[PDB]
Amino acid sequence: DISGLTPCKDSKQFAKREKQQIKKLESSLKLYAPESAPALALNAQIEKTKRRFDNYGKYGLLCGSDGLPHLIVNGDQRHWGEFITPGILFLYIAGWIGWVGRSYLIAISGEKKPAMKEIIIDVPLASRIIFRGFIWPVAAYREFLNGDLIAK
């Protein structure tokens, strides 16, 4: 489809790899008794492998010539969830962390010896500050417009 790739629900190397893995597991399964705990563990492993392959096929990925899925970070609308959808999420969480830390530092800048508050964290003020990062984009944008983000 894109860059000479094959849809993952149509390629044959995917099925061949699945068969190889299943046979490799079943070779070890035969050794033990069918009712024994290792048999149950190996059956669970086989079920997990089958579910993973089915999910990968149903999710609309694209295997390559050799048989493995390929990620597309290009920006096509059919792969929103491949890179772009997770990435934004990360930024959100990441921003949270940063924002919170910055706030805490300012919250201890007033006192005469902030080093004691840096090496021994206090829990009440930190817990007050932690949940303010849930709306970090709005506060950050307002501070940028006001001009309090950058020192002078």
- Residues in contact with another protein by CB under 8 A are 131-132, 134-135, 138-139, 142, 146
Assess 86 for contact with ligand CLA (CB under 6 A): no
Assess 91 for contact with ligand CLA (CB under 6 A): no
Choose the binding region for ligand CLA from 48-56, 59-67, 88-96, 98-106 (rule: CB under 6 A). 98-106
The answer to whether 121 and 115 are in contact (CB under 8 A) is no
Assess 115 for contact with ligand CLA (CB under 6 A): no
Give the residue with the Cβ less far from ligand CLA, 44 or 149.
149
With CB under 5 to 8 Å by kind, the binding choice for 139 among ligand CLA, another protein, none is another protein
Neighbours of 133 (CB within 10 A): 20
Helices 123-130 and 84-107: crossing angle, nearest 10°? Answer: 140
With CB under 5 to 8 Å by kind, the binding choice for 100 among ligand CLA, another protein, none is ligand CLA
Helices 136-146 and 84-107: crossing angle, nearest 10°? Answer: 60
Return residues touching ligand CLA (CB under 6 A).
Answer: 97-98, 100-102, 104, 121, 126, 129, 135, 138
